[PDB]
Amino acid sequence: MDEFEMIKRNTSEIISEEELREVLKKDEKSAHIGFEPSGKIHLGHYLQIKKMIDLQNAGFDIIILLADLTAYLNQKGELDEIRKIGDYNKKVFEAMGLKAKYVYGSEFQLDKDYTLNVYRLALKTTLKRARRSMELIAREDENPKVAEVIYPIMQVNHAHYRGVDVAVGGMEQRKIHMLARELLPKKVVCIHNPVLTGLDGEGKMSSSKGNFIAVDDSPEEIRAKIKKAYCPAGVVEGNPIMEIAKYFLEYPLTIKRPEKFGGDLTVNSYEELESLFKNKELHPMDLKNAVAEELIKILEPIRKRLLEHHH
Amino acid sequence: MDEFEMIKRNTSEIISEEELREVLKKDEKSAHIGFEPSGKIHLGHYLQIKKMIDLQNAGFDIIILLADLTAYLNQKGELDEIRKIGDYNKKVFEAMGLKAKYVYGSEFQLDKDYTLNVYRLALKTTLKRARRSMELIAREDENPKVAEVIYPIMQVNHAHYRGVDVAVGGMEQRKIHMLARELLPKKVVCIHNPVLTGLDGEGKMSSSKGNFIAVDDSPEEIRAKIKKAYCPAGVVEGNPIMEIAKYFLEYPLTIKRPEKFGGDLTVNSYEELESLFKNKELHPMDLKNAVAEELIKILEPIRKRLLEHHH
Ligand SMILES: N[C@@H](Cc1ccc(O)c([N+](=O)[O-])c1)C(=O)O
Ligand SMILES: N[C@@H](Cc1ccc(O)c([N+](=O)[O-])c1)C(=O)O
Ligand SMILES: N[C@@H](Cc1ccc(O)c([N+](=O)[O-])c1)C(=O)O
Ligand SMILES: N[C@@H](Cc1ccc(O)c([N+](=O)[O-])c1)C(=O)O
Ligand code: NA
Ligand code: NA
């Protein structure tokens, strides 16, 4: 497993693998990701931070944007409060083990030169394209605002401003990134991570949809959340519990079961787990129980680092 | 005729007359108008400059924005060239007799605080409202750009930034001004001047439609343009020649005619002219001839001031 395969692990798409290969030959390389500050940091965040750590171990210089200004544009409240959530988010990301350069968008995104560039990009971006690129990002609004279409070109310009080699995001970011790749002189390699299904199975996992597991949830909270989750037997597609097994659990893995249900079961790989589960050889409740306990152990260091701040 | 009536002369609407009355009681009062730089200055410009001179004589401090940045947003070309046209436009406005403070939008519209305000207004302005407000302003584009909707909120913020008492524009500006009146804490009095019909009668007079009389056109040019113009007998509505008689000619006025067509005719007022013309007592060609000669004499000082620069 070389650096390229490590980086590709568990991604949905890399635009493009040949360009990424060229980047990996450089000694000095940069990757960045931006996060609108969020009041709870959940497994979707952690999946992305995990990817930044992968890149960091591949020799990348890592930048994390606390995207306070685009969060303001996306109707998340005042800037001062957004900034305070940003500082909390940074502490969580540090607790996750990421030492990086943390920057607030408003530190530079209001400079004359940045703004002039944003306006130059606004001349090249159609309203229709801008709106399409925000479909999975914009706060729901029956009356969309001008701010919605300024949002994507801020994110495009950021990649230009920083000269970063690689941009990372969830798949929800992919249309903004392909806009960047179309408009900017330097083409950024984009790495997109899968969108986690929320615990209800109804939509995507989000801080605003109340369908997430937070990295600092208590053990009892996690058990309850998993126990209630959508997880139909034989079904992997849109199964949030199977997703968690695929992206966060360490293998080989021992699923503990009562002997009257077959007793303990050791899987050496997610793919092994997947066949057992598709073949209805693994009951949803036994999967839930194992996922819950292993995730508790996975998140424990993060929760304890954050709880030590209170102590 | 007091200051209020002088200011109201030949306007299409004042939003609102009661607010304007309150402004006129102040000793220190400000009015502004903005112009995207234009390669030819025409009678539509002159009508608006005439209104600024009216205000100036009413004791208003006058500001003229050479709107280089919004012109850039509206797809009029580079900024450096736009700025050069702006400087030419200023010289024409001076030749028209307006001594004022001339400012370029880019001198201040890119400052951090200005931009932050623009983004705050973008949170309160719907895309639909922004687009509607640009219907008569935006360059024709089958694929409208994000820049189109940033444009109006720049103009709104400008009024906020300057704290001006009065904003002046053609009626094409009225939806942007009513947006300003809705969003800003200080309500600006808006004075709207009529939109001149182009010489073809087909649409509005514009620098880009080639249907205008420029203030520096030669006498022979003006005669030709007027001679070719739409001017149907008995019709005042959308008659560009009658419009010119109403907004630019001095009364009383002598229309010279051959005796075989009734001989010279003296009208003491546009309204007099209008009845003679509606009653088909005035032939279009005699109207054209008089309009042409009087307009030539009206524009002569402007043309000579500008021609003295070459000399
Ligand atoms: N769109 C990201 C936030 C973001 C990512 C990258 C960026 O460069 C910027 N930005 O420039 O403000 C913002 C989100 O959904 O959380
Ligand atoms: N179309 C997406 C947009 C969206 C998704 C998730 C979110 O958390 C937010 N949000 O915070 O505003 C917005 C949706 O399902 O709503
Ligand atoms: N919309 C005006 C130009 C303009 C008027 C007033 C203004 O404040 C600004 N502006 O702020 O850039 C621009 C035109 O059609 O020519
Ligand atoms: N809808 C208007 C917009 C417009 C009018 C006049 C103009 O000069 C320009 N322009 O310069 O782009 C634009 C039109 O008839 O085209
Ligand atoms: Na080296
Ligand atoms: Na006084």
UniProtKB/Swiss-Prot annotation, chains A, B:
Changing D286A: Decreases the rate of aminoacylation more than 10-fold, without effect on tyrosyl adenylate synthesis. Residues 151-158 are annotated as: Tyrosine. It is found in: Cytoplasm. Its EC number is 6.1.1.1. The keyword Transmembrane helix does not apply. The keyword S-adenosyl-L-methionine does not apply. One of its GO terms (biological process) is tyrosyl-tRNA aminoacylation. Belongs to the class-I aminoacyl-tRNA synthetase family. TyrS type 3 subfamily. Catalyzes the attachment of tyrosine to tRNA(Tyr) in a two-step reaction: tyrosine is first activated by ATP to form Tyr-AMP and then transferred to the acceptor end of tRNA(Tyr). PANTHER family: TYROSINE--TRNA LIGASE, CYTOPLASMIC, TYROSINE-TRNA LIGASE. This is Tyrosine--tRNA ligase. It comes from Methanocaldococcus jannaschii (strain ATCC 43067 / DSM 2661 / JAL-1 / JCM 10045 / NBRC 100440) (Methanococcus jannaschii).
